[PDB]
Ligand binder design. Sequence first.
Ligand SMILES: COc1cccc(Oc2ccc3c(c2)S(=O)(=O)NCN3C2CC2)c1
Ligand SMILES: C=C(C)[C@H]1CN[C@H](C(=O)O)[C@H]1CC(=O)O
Ligand SMILES: C=C(C)[C@H]1CN[C@H](C(=O)O)[C@H]1CC(=O)O
Ligand SMILES: [Cl-]
Ligand SMILES: [Cl-]
Ligand SMILES: [Cl-]
Ligand SMILES: [Cl-]
Ligand SMILES: [Cl-]
Ligand SMILES: [Cl-]
Ligand SMILES: [Cl-]
Ligand SMILES: [Cl-]
Lengths: 254, 254
Amino acid sequence: NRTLIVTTILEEPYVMYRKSDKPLYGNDRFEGYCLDLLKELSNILGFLYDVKLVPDGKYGAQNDKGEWNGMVKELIDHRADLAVAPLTITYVREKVIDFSKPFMTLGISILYRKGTPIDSADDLAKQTKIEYGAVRDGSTMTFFKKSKISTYEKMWAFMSSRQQSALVKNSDEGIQRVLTTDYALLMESTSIEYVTQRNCNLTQIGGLIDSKGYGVGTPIGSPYRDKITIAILQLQEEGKLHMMKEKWWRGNGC
Amino acid sequence: RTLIVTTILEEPYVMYRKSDKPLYGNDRFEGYCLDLLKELSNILGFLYDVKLVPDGKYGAQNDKGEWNGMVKELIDHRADLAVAPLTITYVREKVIDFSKPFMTLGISILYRKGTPIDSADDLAKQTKIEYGAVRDGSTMTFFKKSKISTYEKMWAFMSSRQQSALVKNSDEGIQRVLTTDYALLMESTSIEYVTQRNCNLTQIGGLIDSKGYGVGTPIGSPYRDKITIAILQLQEEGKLHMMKEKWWRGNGCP
Ligand SMILES: COc1cccc(Oc2ccc3c(c2)S(=O)(=O)NCN3C2CC2)c1
Ligand SMILES: C=C(C)[C@H]1CN[C@H](C(=O)O)[C@H]1CC(=O)O
Ligand SMILES: C=C(C)[C@H]1CN[C@H](C(=O)O)[C@H]1CC(=O)O
Ligand SMILES: [Cl-]
Ligand SMILES: [Cl-]
Ligand SMILES: [Cl-]
Ligand SMILES: [Cl-]
Ligand SMILES: [Cl-]
Ligand SMILES: [Cl-]
Ligand SMILES: [Cl-]
Ligand SMILES: [Cl-]
């Protein structure tokens, strides 16, 4: 039967290895928000699918020569039909793949410890005692690199100084850096919500710096893009996306 | 070729400019959507003629499947773009091609200040306080179509007594909230506009759903993808945020 290849990436709570006492195979290896979304999308549109982790473990960014990696590259090269992941819809990516409409909203915000006077990005940009950074090569880092807003230009100049020592390789490294040192992590708000539900010592600082979403990636010209968009809108209007987020985000309270 | 842009009078998106003499053409209008059009035209390089939608409607279908409003202007190729607070919904996205969203919103509650009402559940539980929505808009449709028990209950109340709880437009609803014991179900962007200016009113609770306004194009339009990319660029450059601040900022309230 026609089976779509879905590229994705391990990222809590979107895609995680399921825990079992024996080896797992196929789609049963995984669970998480994105698996539930795939199940709902397939139920509406009637397609079969095979989840496959992106081989290089990357979301998708450009090098100096305009060459892409990650899930974006898998779509460009027609090695996957869909990308289902917290793949941020951005200008540079939308030019080379097709995105569905967003299934989740988010903005860049600040993850930091509780109990401090810091209240906004302006509070970080004006000083240098508190170190701050972002995940290297993600859409958050790219936002600061490209911004012409004075405050975010200043922050990029700090972040990019000293061989980019303020950046981190992944979100888990950044979270541990926040917990151990005087460091603030610039992180997508949905991930902050997940983290602060589980670490009562951490909080979001200020509001959202920008406004964007995660969408399902398809190769340019894909006939599934518009169908997936429609299904996402249906799931939103029925309240199902809200229930899915609550299912996977809610912690044990603080 | 010069593009025909369908739109609708709605504060602060599209308003008649103020002048001492008769105005002509695009110079008749000002507002957020006119600023957005100018920025889209600068990026993509098109000329445009703004034309108010002749029947003064956003877009809904009747029992026989015929559409009206700005949606119908696109369907019949009498407009190339629709630039308005036109909510992206399942039923509309099936018949036109929306750009990606340029502004986020959700359904929420406009009510007077100083009361113990705190959520839609508080309204659904009782009958002393009347509540409704604008007739034939996406908000009314959300409640009509919901299967969530609370929203089914509220729709039962809203549609009773020949729909006396509904209003013809937002200004009528705002005046009803101010004068009587009435709560208006309203898109959060409009609530923010109103409460910035009228300190007797407030938003009750949070957002009931999550959606956005998109630029409409006819199915198959080659402009939809280009407009999406331009919107993403404008968001990442902070220009969409500046445009919202320009038109929404009021004095605020204690
Ligand atoms: C720059 O302005 C922006 C950026 C990002 C989203 C947005 O507005 C939304 C918000 C949500 C949303 C949609 C559009 S949708 O109608 O495109 N798909 C369904 N959802 C809900 C599942 C999330 C506006
Ligand atoms: C978890 C990672 C590295 C991803 C998820 N969304 C962003 C993206 O799609 O680029 C990255 C986060 C960020 O850059 O803050
Ligand atoms: C102002 C009006 C009637 C419009 C604006 N967006 C919705 C739409 O596009 O249907 C309507 C508001 C609402 O239904 O609360
Ligand atoms: Cl399957
Ligand atoms: Cl690597
Ligand atoms: Cl490439
Ligand atoms: Cl300092
Ligand atoms: Cl915010
Ligand atoms: Cl023009
Ligand atoms: Cl789209
Ligand atoms: Cl209050």
